[PDB]
Amino acid sequence: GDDIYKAAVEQLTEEQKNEFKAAFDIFVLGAEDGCISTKELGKVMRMLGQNPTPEELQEMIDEVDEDGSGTVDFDEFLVMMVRCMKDDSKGAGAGVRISADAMMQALLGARAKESLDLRAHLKQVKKED
Ligand SMILES: Cc1cc2c(cc1F)OC[C@@H](NS(=O)(=O)c1cc(C(=O)N3CC(C)(C#N)C3)c(C)[nH]1)[C@H]2O
Numbered sequence: 001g002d003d004i005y006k007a008a009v010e011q012l013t014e015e016q017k018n019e020f021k022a023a024f025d026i027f028v029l030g031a032e033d034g035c036i037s038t039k040e041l042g043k044v045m046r047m048l049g050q051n052p053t054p055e056e057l058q059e060m061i062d063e064v065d066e067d068g069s070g071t072v073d074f075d076e077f078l079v080m081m082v083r084c085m086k087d088d089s090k091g092a093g094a095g096v097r098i099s100a101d102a103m104m105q106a107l108l109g110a111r112a113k114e115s116l117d118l119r120a121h122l123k124q125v126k127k128e129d
């Protein structure tokens with residue numbers, strides 16, 4: 001998507017990228033093509049307590065899709081986070097949007113030390129374009 005996203009995604013280090021990589025693993029755990037489809041997408045979101053749809057879920061991935069095959073990979077997933085923090089990609093309205101920290105809350109795990117702390121919740125951004 002927007003260069004601002006890619007710039008940040010690539011800027012991420014091995015540690016930062018790993019934090020998100022894990023979430024992707026559990027997301028596409030035993031997938032058909034190791035990708036995130038509407039099936040796994042909603043199946044994971046609902047876990048948090050959501051009730052999306054097969055027609056709406058497609059809009060999410062489609063918006064965060066690169067090739068437009070109807071799925072999201074790791075490299076693409078990261079872009080969803082960088083943009084999520086900004087909240088520019090999409091907007092709530094369908095009952096309850098999804099946050100990078102939320103969607104991952106189920107993947108990585110309920111407990112968390114980073115999210116818990118306020119300082120380790122979110123850092124500034126330097127995307128001078
Ligand atoms: C493949 C993937 C992609 C996305 C994921 C996780 C993923 F697994 O979470 C974040 C999402 N962006 S979003 O702006 O939150 C966002 C919410 C919505 C929406 O219509 N609903 C909120 C809802 C789930 C409820 N109740 C229904 C849309 C279209 N975009 C999107 O980037």
Ligand SMILES: [Ca+2]
Nearest residue numbers: 069070071072
């Ligand atoms: Ca795809």
